[PDB]
Amino acid sequence: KGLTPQSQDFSEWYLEVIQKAELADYGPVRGTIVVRPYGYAIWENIQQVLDRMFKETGHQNAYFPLFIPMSFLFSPELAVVTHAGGEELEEPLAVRPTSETVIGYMWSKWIRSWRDLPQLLNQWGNVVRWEMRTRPFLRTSEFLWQEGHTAHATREEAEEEVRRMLSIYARLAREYAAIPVIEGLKTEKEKFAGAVYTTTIEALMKDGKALQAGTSHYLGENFARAFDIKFQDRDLQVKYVHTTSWGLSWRFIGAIIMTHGDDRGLVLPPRLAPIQVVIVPIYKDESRERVLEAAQGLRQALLAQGLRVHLDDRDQHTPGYKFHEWELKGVPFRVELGPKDLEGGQAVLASRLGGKETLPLAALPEALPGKLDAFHEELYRRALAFREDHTRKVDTYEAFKEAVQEGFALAFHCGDKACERLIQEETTATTRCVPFEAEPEEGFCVRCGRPSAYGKRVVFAKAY
């Protein structure tokens, strides 16, 4: 057996690594998947981090209904309940594709004065956006995510919120997933329908395609107006609130897999990996007892350092087999504990990134955290390298067509949907975002030639 190399067929690589690492499996219903323990463990760590962040910024979790009145909101990407309770529903119900509406409805009745603001809500849950074609974590009918919703008195506080969150998403990606990203602004064609504008963080997968890791929307008074959400300000004036919306789904897991995965399988970032150190004991019948005891002692010492450790006791498998399994599963470090090692009060530390090294057993606990960090740092620097190595400034549409086969294309655009739409029908590439810290440039649209829009180059790429 093996594993289709990325260069041969990335899509297959992806699908197989997901299956073999037991991250997920396919559900009986088309477009639906089953997230197995190891994969779900990753999602939990993401929840934990984001949740802490959201909390430190005054948000509070709540839980709104799965079912939304159709009238609020048959659209294609919508699953509809029509039968329920045996009889046929008066009005057909939609399975939430997002929660803005229902929350708006409730906000309408909860918000009265400026004392009811700001509204800082977050909800962890599932949503359904129909798709009969499957692709684990990247595009599925049902999927888990976190969707935040806030309501403000002023348009300024709202926008500061929109940014605050995108930065959180970015911190999650950079300091925890070691996934580099571009903080930017979607174009009119690419933004959220009901939003005024949409901010996003874009990542580059090892296959060159781009991925939207998370979005943060400024909704202005669209929903306030649509759902009548007003309040009496301090100046005794009854005005409309300004709402924002932000969300990150398990697609972020897909990003992790496609940003660091190699031909041996997964490579999970230390800060989010279910298992950080996997201990693989190595023995013969006469060594087993004493060797396993050491392993368990080591397991304790590591658990104490607050590390996430796993001891692979499975006796039905050989050391070499295990070495592979865990490399497949992306565990950052492996500790090989054999009789020779045990004899010399040492052990071997093999890094998923590459290399083995011998160290004494007692030193191991204190030394792993730092090594784990160094591990993180490396992963990130390599991803960075990869990104730069695949981002390119295109001036001639011919250069553009070439660069969007490799990765990011930094071109100019007229800011015309019609043109944008054409570039996609042609090269399939799309607008990823108008980067915020992007250098100021003025030129002419790469495909139609009309004066450059956005006063800076737009990030283009074939995306997921």
Next chain:
Amino acid sequence: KGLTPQSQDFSEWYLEVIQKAELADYGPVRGTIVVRPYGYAIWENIQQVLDRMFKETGHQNAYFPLFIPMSFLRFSPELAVVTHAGGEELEEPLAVRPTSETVIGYMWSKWIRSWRDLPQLLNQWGNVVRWEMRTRPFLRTSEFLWQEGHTAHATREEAEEEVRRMLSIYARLAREYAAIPVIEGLKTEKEKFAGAVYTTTIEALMKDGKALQAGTSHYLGENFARAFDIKFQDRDLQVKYVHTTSWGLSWRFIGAIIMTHGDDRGLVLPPRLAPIQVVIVPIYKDESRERVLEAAQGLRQALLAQGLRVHLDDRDQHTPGYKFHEWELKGVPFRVELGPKDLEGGQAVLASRLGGKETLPLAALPEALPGKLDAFHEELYRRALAFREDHTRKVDTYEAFKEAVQEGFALAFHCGDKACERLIQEETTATTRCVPFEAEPEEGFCVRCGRPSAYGKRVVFAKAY
């Protein structure tokens, strides 16, 4: 203040306290609710506790699909059905999961091959839909959050041990965290889970006398294994079906918390699951608003340092007496009253939602609270116990029975026949709560039909939620 007293109309008391304490609100769709922050905070603490307990017992969370193939369930009333999706009409209509046994079975069928593949120790935190067009927050709603565990074993014994391991967890959650007393027992054939061999449960008594099923744990034998073809080759070369179990606890547990300890002043939350354990209320006047608030702010840090979940109520817009009532309504166990005066004397007033009032040095507080919170929990539980005892009654005649099922628990003898049981329910509207595990050995005659007593002990009866 207009909180309908429990004795006047419990149902209204319940509904209003939920509204006023901002635990939840009604959603636009019939039977659906919205869990507001404060209420959801409670659910989160429950998750936290249960999950640590599930984890220490080797379970692992996973996430299975919301949509289940109708054929798997073979439209049954309690189901919500998707028929339209993607614009076109579905080939086969999809059911919104009312529970996950089936889909997990399907998956288990393909994952399990060897005994080395068992046990399967799975748990899933999520939502499920069981249609109901009539609403009652946390007690009975169309959609609701819960935790549903599923395990697969090689032997029936390991499976049954799992079934009791979990019910005990549920019971520990109720007793050591919710301070809600409960009876660990076994449902009767009429009252068990359809697909289960047998059903274990924990039963609680609400302040209105009605009973509530806080959590269940089922032994499914080989029903699903067989239904979904879940076999494996054992150490003995023999191929066989696995033995699966199932257990679940929903946010109905919140309803239990509300109805077990709630009083006419409103909620009374058990300290171990309360989102706010201590509320600081600074009392002052402009010429002291600076020093009081300074101390209050300081005490806040001192308390957070202790890991205590505290909330400071600065709200200058409101009067002390107003805040006092709000926090008694929302159930906060303790209140610290920090006044202009007592700060120079260095003392403060600690007031417990249970009638305690004491003065203590601000310095002693941080350290003293933890133990007090414990003493609190104990008392909550003590009272609930007392209530239940005062509302449980051994009956030997069907007249006494009818009387006792108006007050609470009725400990009657039964024949063991579903027919009689369904009769007792048609007449008295009472049902079987459970056949207690630790009940005292007793033989007698069915409280209604006269025939010799089954179970070898008294069955717990009651009007239930």
Next chain:
RNA sequence: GGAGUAGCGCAGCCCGGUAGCGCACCUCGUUCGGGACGAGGGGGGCGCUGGUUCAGAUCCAGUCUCC
């Protein structure tokens, strides 16, 4: 033009005989420092619907499905 046969990958159909092989899985022993070895085993009735036949993955007719 091919192909739907065990979880996965395949052969068997021409010249009908009651289903086979690799991987995986179960047993036992030997192994164990980079995916072990031997022997012994378990699991499907061949996409679906007809038909011919003593007998049908195999022959005939037809239908569905992926390239």
